[PDB]
């Protein structure tokens, strides 16, 4: 706002949440703007590799950043993720080959891993209260929904009204503004190793109560990851829908996520996080089961709403529970426990398009949806074990 407000105020912890939200929003906007422009060895191999590069590289780089945050601190990885994201945006703006696009996607994956892991660990470290941690984590998770909701129209408007490189140049400018905001809250020039050494990643992966939450997130997000690309193909084949209907059919699934992540961050602590996740998994299963029973565009409005709402419920309930569990049963170091959560998010986006296409070609879209729904419903009862884990 006004320079007077900037120069005369106590820097609150809400600035860290704002930084995390902005970084996640810009990351998702960059991820979503590129997709309409990608078509511009075998072409089937090239397209699949280009689609899976970002998620695969982020998945590979998550644990290293998790250990790095403990070794040196959060702000330096946050700033590094910033710099890598800006370089990736510039490379997208000024490239025309295929190898350069692949390199840009890989760099974006590295930067996204850094930003997500470091920011979520930082938020967990500065917000040790369960209720406030849940609230801030829901607010931060709303950034993904905001980005995936704003990206496509922004890219489409800037593509034909100004030029091809205009969306990327504008996004790079927004990134520069984000870094300008970042430079006034952090000190990305000093190494600040944490006081206590966290538990080994192998020890955390042997904890049943962490694996359950990670599997909840993974199985919840895999359904949307496999449904997002497969739905337009089925709609074109069956409903003979037009070009804009393909875009607008999936709009409720993003609006409902945006609503749910913001609203349930508060209600999860009141109603029981285990119960919230259980109900979210059941609702995702039922909605995905009901998706292939629609014959018109109007039949896809309610199931998509349910899918998005319940995925938001699951994410906002099981995001703070990782920090809660590591506090309850392990050492209160959050760098390496949110790497597991990020890997759970990234697995579905990595293996979504390829597996979804293979299964849809093999048995069909309705059978794929039925499989996803049955898997989610069967996994839902496992959340009962998170209501009262044994203490340390």
């Amino acid at each position, epitope marked *: 706002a006004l320079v007077r407000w900037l*120069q*005369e105020s*106590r*820097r*609150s*912890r809400k*600035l*860290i949440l704002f930084i995390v939200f902005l970084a996640l929003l810009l990351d998702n906007m960059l991820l979503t703007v590129v997709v309409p422009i990608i078509p511009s060895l075998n072409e089937n191999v090239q397209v699949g590799l280009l689609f899976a590069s970002k998620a695969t590289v982020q998945l590979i780089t998550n644990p290293f950043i998790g250990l790095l945050t403990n070794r040196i*601190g*959060y*702000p330096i990885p946050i700033f590094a993720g910033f710099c890598i994201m800006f370089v990736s945006t510039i490379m997208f703006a000024f490239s025309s080959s295929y190898a350069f696009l692949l390199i840009a996607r890989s760099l974006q994956g590295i930067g996204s891993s850094c930003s997500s892991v470091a920011g979520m660990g930082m938020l967990a470290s*500065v*917000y*040790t*209260d369960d209720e*406030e941690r849940g609230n801030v984590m829901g607010i931060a998770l709303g950034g993904l929904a905001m980005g995936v909701l704003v990206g496509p129209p922004f890219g489409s408007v800037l593509y034909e009204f100004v030029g091809k490189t205009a969306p990327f140049l504008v996004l790079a400018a927004l990134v520069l503004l984000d870094g300008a905001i970042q430079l*006034f*809250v*952090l*000190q990305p020039s*000093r190494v*600040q190793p944490e006081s206590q050494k966290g538990t080994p990643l192998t020890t955390l992966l042997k904890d049943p109560y962490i694996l359950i939450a990670a599997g909840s997130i993974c199985f919840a997000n895999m359904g949307i990851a496999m449904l997002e690309p497969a739905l337009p193909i089925w709609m074109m084949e069956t409903m003979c829908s037009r070009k804009w209907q393909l875009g607008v059919a999936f709009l409720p699934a993003s609006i409902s996520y945006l609503i749910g992540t913001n609203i349930f961050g508060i209600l999860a602590h009141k109603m029981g996080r285990w119960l919230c996740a259980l109900l979210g998994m059941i609702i995702v299963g039922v909605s995905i089961l009901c998706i292939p029973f629609a014959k018109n565009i109007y039949g896809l409005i309610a199931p998509n709403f349910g899918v998005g709402f319940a995925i938001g419920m699951v994410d906002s309930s099981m995001m703070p529970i990782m920090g809660y569990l590591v506090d309850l049963r392990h050492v209160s170091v959050y760098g390496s426990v949110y790497a597991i959560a990020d890997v759970a998010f990234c697995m579905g986006y990595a293996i979504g398009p390829s597996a979804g296409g293979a299964i849809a070609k093999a048995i069909g879209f309705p059978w794929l949806m039925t499989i996803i729904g049955i898997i989610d419903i069967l996994f839902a009862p496992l959340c009962f074990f998170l209501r009262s884990p044994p203490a340390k």
Partner: antibody
Amino acid sequence: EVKLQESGAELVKPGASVKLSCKASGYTFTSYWIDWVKQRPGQGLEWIGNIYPGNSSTNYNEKFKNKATLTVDTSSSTAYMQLSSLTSDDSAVYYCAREDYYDGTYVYYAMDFWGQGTSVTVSS
Amino acid sequence: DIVMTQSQKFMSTSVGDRVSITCKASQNVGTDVSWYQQKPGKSPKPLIYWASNRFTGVPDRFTGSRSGTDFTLTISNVQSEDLADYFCEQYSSYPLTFGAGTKLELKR
């Protein structure tokens, strides 16, 4: 070592101004905020104001806008608070404190170092 | 303004007992509360920051908790050097407000 030193005591006539000093040493003066607080005997603490020695930007309690004026001398690294038109109600102990940032960030978490108070008495 | 009500001015304890000091906010200050201890002949020093975190060097006896707008400072094993004044501040909204201090005293 961080140290904020204050005058031991001050004697002031009624209806006269007083200038209290707070000398800072052991750190870069222009990088941390300085807080002035008041404690009247038998009562709770009262926040008087903030000053940033770098930008010389101040924050005042609306109760103390007319009474208190905060200034900074960066050549000798001193913080001054001037009180005008003193009455018998102003007899209290005035504390000078420094705000600290969380490690690796610029967010405030506590006033880690306080200076010993200055006992101002207003008697004729 | 937000009034931080600290109920009891004087509290009597014994060496080895547990003591709890309460500070109630007025307009829903969210974990923006700090605790300070002032020894009889010294300047105040912080104990708890952000209403739950313990300052560096503070012994494990001191702990802080929040339940809505109520903040509690607990000393599990009171010692002879824990007899001092304790007060709470909130910095969620200007102006800063401090609760009236609480003094620990022995029993006999």
